[PDB]
From a paper:
Here, we develop a general method for designing self-assembling proteins that uses predicted structures of oligomeric proteins from thermophilic organisms as building blocks. Of the 359 identified thermophilic trimer homologs, 191 yielded high-confidence AF2 predictions [predicted aligned error (pAE) < 5, predicted local distance difference test (pLDDT) > 90]. We docked these predicted structures in the so-called “I3” architecture by aligning their threefold symmetry axes to the corresponding axes of icosahedral point group symmetry, using the Rosetta SymDofMover to sample the translational and rotational degrees of freedom along this shared axis [Fig. 1C, (27)]. To evaluate the accuracy of our design method at high resolution, we used single-particle cryoelectron microscopy (cryo-EM) to determine the structures of one nanoparticle from each of the successful PDB seeds.
We measured the aggregation temperature (Tagg) for each nanoparticle by monitoring DLS while heating from 25 to 84 °C, which showed that all nanoparticles retained their intended assembly state until at least 60 °C, and I3-[name] did not aggregate in the measured range. Icosahedral 3D reconstructions at 2.5 Å, 2.3 Å, and 3.5 Å resolution were obtained for I3-A6, I3-[name], and I3-A7, respectively, allowing us to build atomic models of each nanoparticle. Comparing the experimental cryo-EM structures to the computational design models demonstrated that AF2 structure prediction was quite accurate: The all-atom rmsd for a single monomer of I3-A6, I3-[name], and I3-A7 were 1.3 Å, 1.7 Å, and 1.4 Å, respectively. Aligning two subunits across the designed interfaces revealed that these were designed with high accuracy, yielding alpha-carbon rmsds of 0.7 Å, 1.1 Å, and 1.5 Å, respectively. In each case, the rotameric states of the interdigitated hydrophobic side chains at the designed interfaces corresponded well with the design models, as did the polar residues lining the periphery of the I3-A6 and I3-[name] interfaces. Slight rigid body deviations between the building blocks added up to alpha-carbon rmsds of 1.6 Å, 2.2 Å, and 2.2 Å across the entire 60-subunit nanoparticle for I3-A6, I3-[name], and I3-A7, respectively. These values are comparable to those obtained from previous computational nanoparticle design campaigns that started from high-resolution crystal structures of the building blocks.
Residue numbers in the entry:
A (entry chain 9), B (entry chain 6), C (entry chain w), D (entry chain 4): 1 to 136, 144 to 169, 177 to 251
The structure:
């Protein structure tokens, strides 16, 4: 039961992906009692999991699994291990630690479409859910090509690196409408670390939009924005 | 200790791959007491493992594992599951049954070089040892391209479909010499189901040659051929 | 439960008759755990049952009965006993040993149509299932006469001696089509000891065709051929 | 043992000084399990220790001491006590609380070079490790004079107030090269509260550079930047 339960009206809620930079284990155990209902995925940011103690990483993953959250290591660590030639050992250690998903990217390295598809099948047949990063010359048509290529290669979701906002910070609605006409947006996730970006995507697509790089203390804020309980979206959703 | 141990002279022994068509479980348990020292891999032929009871398949794999043998399902079962779109569930069931390797082939299907490389990484990152089948227009140079492509993609061994023998059954020694000049033959395995083929490869490359499709009752015959203890190779090795 | 159970598609399976030349008792007990689901009848070949120890013959028959298989002695032993004038003692000993069927033939003897029908009723009223052998001058029309005569006399199945293949080894499809127009092929069984014959009948009549003289180690091979899990019938059935 | 231990390559790591604004005691106890291996010193910021309960300050200092971290009160509290004439009582209370170092500064007060040297000896002979703050007219040569004066007076480290970055945010590399030619940079520490400054110093001097005013939640980020595990320093270190 929520406080003020009589104010609840039911709605379609999109995915939330949370960025964890290194939260303490028993802080995570208590933090999920407030907002574990509103998180779908957690990214351990970039290579941060390769810095932390191995029993601390396992203990944190068990706390997220008790709420049904899927945890994964950021794609920079895959690109690191891939550049060292260690990609099979990276995939094996992910399974021993207990991640349920992996992210494929070429943000710090160059990887061909042949190697990218091979890496996607590599991760699926190893038993992970697969996410990919798109956005790195790229017109909106070139993003549409890469998104469709990753979905046809078998990625479960595509993350748009965040492009979609102009020099002032207003959303480029023509490109965003062209994207929605050419791609199944139910399989797309947008990076929206700033509250103004979260408002712009919610006002464009409604409460069902999928969002990523959400800061751990803004999870409750985002749920109030989806539900119309903050002055930015009050009476608009 | 072997009978007549004083006749033993030590030598470099190549790989043996045995073909199992459906041997009974407690027949396999007793059979390995005679010749388990001389087997490296067992192929469960084509789709035969998809016909047998699941507890019988597990029981057989445990008997081969007690002698350190690596068991795998033949490449036609991969092509079947791949043609149905079930390739990830095929890899998952292989792990649950306890196979330690898989074979990638296109003997009945058509698969591109791009899909073939993606399937090889698929199997490697899932933690299997990977074998591939080559031979299906192909000159000796086209075999050499395909062998090097599968080895560069990361196959642990390449099996040559058996081409290498003429219309009478004599070995095409010029093509076989061109192969040995362009490929690391320590990673190549030759199909040799007939005793005359086993003799031709042993006389060309010595006891260290790797051989496949060996019938279960010819394993002891092959060890006598490698060791010079049968009239075909007597005094020639 | 079969291994890879998710690949199973349900189909109409025809009869399999297996030839036993003298398999050991506890080999049979273990062998049926692999392939007893895919056998309908076992022929003890020619006169081999008259050579073996009487308690060994009973012990083998009980192992086949535990899987619901019907065992019978080959028709050359009936022709032997009939030529000695001992046919009633042969029928009595079959019941004491525990065979559930008998085969009537004239492959080495000469027997009139009158005596043939009298022998068919002889075996039915004694309580056996009756099979007959046809093929010994005979055009396809003369086979069609003999098949209908044996079915009208009351035989449960007619076995075609295997005629149906040319001098190269290709099936004589014109005669085989004329047969299917004149005879109920659900009561016909074809001899097919070679894998090329098994493929030719499966491609002509589908998975539901009835086959005989199957070697004991080829039963799993035949089930993969019926199910399309081997390169000869892959994607054709 | 770290997660992904096989990716570790050994390297020279510089000092990290962390700013604590008032973290809760049992939050600090859990937080050090994640990143206590990557902290050398903790500054209790400005006068914040004089606002907190005396048993809470002791409890926090004991949690930092269990990881070998040296805690100190920020130099504004020394300047406060010095301006009141109470500097000897401030030194006495620091020993009773259990700080292991002190910071000498004139950031808000005016103090002569005579009084500054007397304060450095005051703190050393009382048994503390001594840090000083430099930067307040000053050319890079005048910074060099003050750094050498504090090191000759006996300071264990000198902190550069953070000058070294231009009006756009780019590092003034000409002055930074002149500094490194005149001063032992192993005894210098740079203030770098922003990630762009931390990157600029790591790219100029390598992973061995000493950094200060690191936010408590950015300690794991900084260790990934030193180790090349984040896109800013990926492949550059």
């Amino acid at each position: 039961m929520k406080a003020f339960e009589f104010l609840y009206e039911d709605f379609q809620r999109g995915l939330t992906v949370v960025l964890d930079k290194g939260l303490p284990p028993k802080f995570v155990e208590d933090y999920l009692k407030v907002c574990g209902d509103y998180i779908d995925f957690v990214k351990f940011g970039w290579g941060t999991s390769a810095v932390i103690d191995r029993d601390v990483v396992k203990e944190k993953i068990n706390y997220y699994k008790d709420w049904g959250i899927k945890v994964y290591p950021g794609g920079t660590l895959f690109e690191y291990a891939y550049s060292k030639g260690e990609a099979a050992e990276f995939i094996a250690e992910c399974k021993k630690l207990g991640f349920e998903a992996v992210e494929i990217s070429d943000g710090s390295s160059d990887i061909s479409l042949d190697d990218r598809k091979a890496a996607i099948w590599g991760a699926k047949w190893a038993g992970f859910m697969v996410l990919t990063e798109v956005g790195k010359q790229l017109t909106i048509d070139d993003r549409i090509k890469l998104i469709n290529f990753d979905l046809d290669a078998g990625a479960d979701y595509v993350i748009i690196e965040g492009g979609l906002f102009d020099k002032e910070g207003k959303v480029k609605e023509n490109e965003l409408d062209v994207l929605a006409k050419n791609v199944d947006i139910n399989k797309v996730i947008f990076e929206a670390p700033q509250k103004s970006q979260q408002v712009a995507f919610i006002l464009k697509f409604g409460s069902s939009v999928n969002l990523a790089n959400i800061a751990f203390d803004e999870v409750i804020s985002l749920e109030t924005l989806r539900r119309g309980l903050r002055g930015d979206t009050f009476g608009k959703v």
